[PDB]
Design a protein around this ligand. Structure first.
Ligand code: K
Ligand code: K
Ligand code: K
Ligand code: K
Ligand code: K
Lengths: 367, 367
């Protein structure tokens, strides 16, 4: 009998990467002035967005089934490990079945291979169940509906890491020039080029800061979580689905970004994505506050020491993005600058969150 | 005081992905008959290969420094978590500095920004050390040279997962056709197309099986490892570096694959990569057998129950790849078929490894 921790971690990594890499087609969508107000391509963009959403949700359902199964298994074996690898192999093909369905929705091939993949996952999981039940020692101690916190955390970490990787790759592929366009830039000089490249580098830092602070909020929340509800699982799945779309909000090479659009509505889109990624973490926290006793640790209960701190940590980004959107709709003038300033202010607020919360609540105290 | 497990797992995931995604430039290298025997582009391919190797090794050195640091830290904090995120952000930029150096090696800009990134990583880690030492409770229990097995395992898992993702993405982007080339294929019929697409799908299954079986061997080895040596760490780093090159051996869209080359030498290249990825795992095992007492569990010691099983598990792929290369050099006729057959036989051998080993050693016993 062997421990199953590492195998499940590998499965979580693979599944998270598979669910998150469906955003690349969306980033690669190209609209330029040839189709400025073309309806077909403009709705094609939303088509690809929705396709990404559904593929992510399907892969997440598969991951949840895997979690429920290896909650029952408990201890792994060589045969069980190879069967798990087969299941991973079958799951990895679902994105391809969707990728064949997108181009020819009416012709039934994609239908056929998608159903085949699903039924194959089913038979593989059933074989795992049978092999485990045949040998008692391979079953869980209790058998021999909460989700597992470790698997949720691993999936979330994988998604966030893949997002950051996408950002850095965008930068690396855009900015790096080659010679003759270099000396068409300047006196064969790449220092002038470099500082003509600086805002791009610093934008990368800003986007990575956004993603890392969202991960920090999720990590702080789940450090204080005793048990993970199914509702919290759904809300985390939605939060991660909208986190996967952050590259679309922060990218330069992406043919999505290279399209005719004003600064104000790009700010609106980015703030929409950020708000949707954050409000679901806040919703997880609110839902857990419903039965703290089973879902939360005593420190963050109503009237606890770190209750206000956690609430502020989770409500920082929602409020900032919402007020930036409100600036877009209200001011009409200083919106892009307000977005830039928010991307700078939120990190420092996270760094000095404790002092801010303390002095703020004292102020509210005596006045 | 908070637990540092999840933060370190996230760091490992990010670093593994960053180290492994440098292979994409190598896959995207394009050579076609315009430059059939051009020396410049042919050596440019090896240039990009070496660049990938060095970038991987540098990122691995950074990851090892991070491991050594948070071996001393032990318990994390909000400030320490944000500083760790800053360190990750700084490390993610190293691939970009190399990406700017590749195009202009002589101009000193890449030099400058690479040195700046390294010194920034240094100051961030020094600040973490100082903040930790200032507060005793944030230090390790003992302080208040073996590597950590958990971090090694996480890094390896990330690398393998990224490789599998690259493979599936290759398939998805190549094969999916669009309409007018569909009905240029056939009677507007995508079933004929599909079975004109089948060898590609099944090649994906084969490559994923290769990667998953290598991961299975690594997992079985490290399940029986009590302590991880520095030499074992170096050998694992080399094994992972050559594992990252498996997509180059198994890919179809990659402009690397779409170049003039015979089947025999492509087989040779793939078998070379596989042998280099496997011999280093076998070397880790041999090195650990030098001081089993501290590095290995009793079950796999000389004369143990699972000693022969582990040796066979780790020597399966090396011998198969070596004999396929030997077929290429000797037979000259049946080499490609032998490679295809090996890609089928090795998995089943892994599935029936125990029975094979048992009956083989009994045979050798009485005869
Ligand atoms: K884990
Ligand atoms: K991961
Ligand atoms: K881990
Ligand atoms: K990983
Ligand atoms: K990628």
């Amino acid at each position: 009998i062997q421990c199953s921790q590492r195998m499940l971690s590998f499965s979580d990594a693979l599944l998270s990467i598979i669910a998150t890499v469906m955003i690349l087609p969306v980033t690669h969508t190209e609209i330029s002035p040839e189709q400025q107000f073309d309806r077909s391509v403009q709705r094609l963009l939303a088509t690809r967005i929705a396709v990404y959403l559904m593929t992510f949700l399907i892969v997440t359902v598969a991951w949840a089934a895997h979690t429920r199964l290896f909650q029952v298994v408990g201890k792994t074996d060589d045969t069980l490990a190879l069967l798990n690898l087969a299941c991973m192999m079958t799951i990895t093909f679902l994105p391809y079945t969707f990728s064949l369905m997108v181009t020819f929705p009416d012709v039934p091939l994609g239908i056929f291979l998608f159903c085949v993949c699903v039924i194959a996952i089913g038979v593989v999981q059933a074989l795992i169940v049978g092999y485990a039940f045949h040998f008692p020692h391979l079953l869980s101690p209790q058998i021999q509906e909460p989700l597992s916190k470790e698997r949720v955390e691993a999936f979330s970490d994988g998604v966030y890491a893949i997002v950051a990787t996408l950002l850095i790759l965008d930068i690396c592929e855009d900015n790096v020039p080659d010679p003759k366009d270099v000396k068409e830039r300047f006196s064969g000089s790449l220092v002038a080029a470099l500082s003509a490249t600086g805002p791009r580098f610093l934008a990368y830092f800003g986007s990575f800061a956004t993603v890392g602070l969202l991960w920090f909020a999720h990590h702080s929340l789940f450090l204080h979580v005793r048990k993970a509800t199914r509702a919290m699982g759904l809300l985390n799945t939605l939060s991660l689905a909208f986190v996967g779309g952050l590259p679309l909000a922060y990218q330069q090479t992406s043919a999505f970004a290279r399209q005719p659009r004003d600064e104000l509505e790009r700010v609106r889109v980015s703030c929409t994505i950020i708000f949707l990624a954050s409000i679901f973490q806040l919703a997880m926290w609110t839902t857990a506050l419903l039965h703290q006793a089973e879902t939360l640790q005593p420190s963050v209960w109503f009237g606890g020491r770190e209750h206000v701190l956690m609430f502020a940590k989770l409500a920082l980004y929602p409020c900032a993005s919402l007020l930036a959107f409100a600036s877009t709709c209200l001011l009409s003038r200083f919106s892009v600058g307000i977005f830039h300033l928010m991307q700078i202010a939120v990190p420092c607020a996270f760094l000095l969150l404790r002092l801010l919360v303390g002095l703020a609540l004292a102020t509210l105290r005596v006045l």
